[PDB]
């Protein structure tokens, strides 16, 4: 795969864009988790799959019985990894571009975490799309949080819902989804 268009997909709590606490997610949003599964899995043409790329810490935070994430090519980045094809579902590498070099029959490429990876790749021109689940809470400062996105969104344009709908195909997009004290919306951003 040469110069793939890449999408960041993330769920973040406004206004600070917190995404984690001591190596874990600060919430469990069932519908959001299903959205993530559906969007990263879905392909528009037959006989392809998508790639999901993540940092070593995020990979390790998926319980071992539940990785690799099914139906997607999983790529894990570590500074200690030489290039290695582990199996048909798992690749080890030290950059996104090198990891995708011998990869074929992949449609979309998603960056799925975590903070360090997101905060590097936001300034990688291969990333053309941000799929940000914008989470709100009445008292956001009360949620324990130590891990944040550093996204210069001034350089980005939040697209209308019609663009997000086109991107996700027939995936149902509900507005102002409420779980416990959290309210959320799915968004799509592109570069200016
Ligand atoms: N809310 C959300 O949507 C999501 C939140 N998260 C959260 O993010 C947090 C995890 O993020 P974080 O701790 O930053 O860890 P990451 O998952 O980003 O992993 C960081 C590791 O990735 C490897 N890495 C980073 N940059 C490079 C590079 N340029 N080349 C090669 N390897 C690299 C390194 O591995 P090594 O040390 O092996 O060299 C590094 O230690 C957790 O709290 C998690 O719950 C995660 C996903 C989604
Ligand atoms: C380590 O963090 C996980 C654990 C699990 C998981 C899977 C099975 C059982 C338990 C946890 C799934 C996904 C993840 C991570 C990779 C995620 C995510 C994610 C989610 C959930 N939403 C959005 N919008 N973007 C994302 N990147």
Instruction: Transcribe 107-154 into DSSP letters.
Output: EEEEEEE-HHHHHHHTT-TTEEEEEEEEEE-SSGGGS---EE----GG
Q: Which residues contact 124 (CB under 8 A, 6 or more apart)?
A: 6, 96
Query: How many Cα atoms sit within 13 Å of 24 on the Cβ side?
Result: 7
Nearest to 78 by CA among 95, 66, 60: 95
How many domains are contained in the chain? 1
Record the tokens describing residue 119, joined without a space: 């905060």
Q: What resolution in Å is listed for this PDB structure?
A: 1.8
Residue 116 annotated as lining a ligand binding site:
yes
A 10 A CB-CB count for 181 gives 13
Paired sense of beta strands 156-158 and 182-191, if any:
antiparallel
Which domain does 155 fall in, by range? 1-192
| 125 annotated ligand binder | no
CA distances from 181 to 32, 146, 157 (A): 14, 20, 28
As for ligand 1, residues whose beta carbon falls within 6 Å of it are 10-11, 19-20, 23-25, 54-58, 61, 77-80, 94-95, 113-117, 120, 147
Residue 103 and residue 122: Cα distance in Å, rounded? 22
118 carries a ligand binding annotation: yes
Residue to probe by mutation, ligand 1, list 7, 62, 79, most atoms within 8 Å of CB = 79
Instruction: Say how many CA atoms lie within 13 Å of 146 toward its Cβ.
Output: 4
Question: Given the CA of residue 59, which atom of ligand 1 is nearest to it?
Answer: 17
CA distance 146 to 154: 23
Rounded to whole angstroms, how far apart are CA atoms 94 and 119? Answer: 16
- 90-93 and 177-179 beta bridge pairing: unpaired
The reply to whether ligand 2 has any atom less than 6 angstroms from the CB of 113 is yes
- Quickly list H helices, the chain: 30-41, 56-61, 96-99, 115-121, 161-168
Pairing of strands 73-77, 18-20: unpaired
CATH number of residue 151's parent domain: 3.40.430.10
């Amino acid at each position: 795969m040469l110069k793939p268009n890449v999408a960041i997909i993330v769920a973040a709590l406004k206004p600070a864009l917190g995404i984690g606490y001591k190596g874990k997610m600060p919430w469990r949003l069932r519908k959001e988790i299903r959205y993530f599964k559906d969007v990263t899995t879905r392909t528009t043409k037959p006989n392809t799959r998508n790639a999901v790329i993540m940092g070593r810490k995020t990979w390790e935070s998926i319980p071992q019985k539940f990785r690799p994430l099914p139906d997607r090519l999983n790529i894990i980045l570590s500074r200690s990894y030489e290039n290695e094809i582990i199996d048909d579902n798992i690749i080890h590498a030290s950059s996104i571009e090198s990891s995708l070099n011998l990869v074929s029959d992949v449609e979309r490429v998603f960056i799925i975490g975590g903070a360090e990876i997101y905060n590097e790749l936001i300034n990688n021109s291969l990333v053309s799309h941000l799929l940000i689940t914008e989470i709100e809470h009445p008292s956001p400062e009360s949620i324990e949080m130590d891990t944040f996105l550093k996204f210069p969104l001034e350089s980005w344009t939040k697209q209308p819902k019609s663009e997000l709908q086109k991107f996700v195909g027939d995936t149902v997009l509900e507005d102002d989804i409420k779980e416990g004290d959290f309210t959320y919306n799915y968004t799509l951003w592109t570069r200016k």
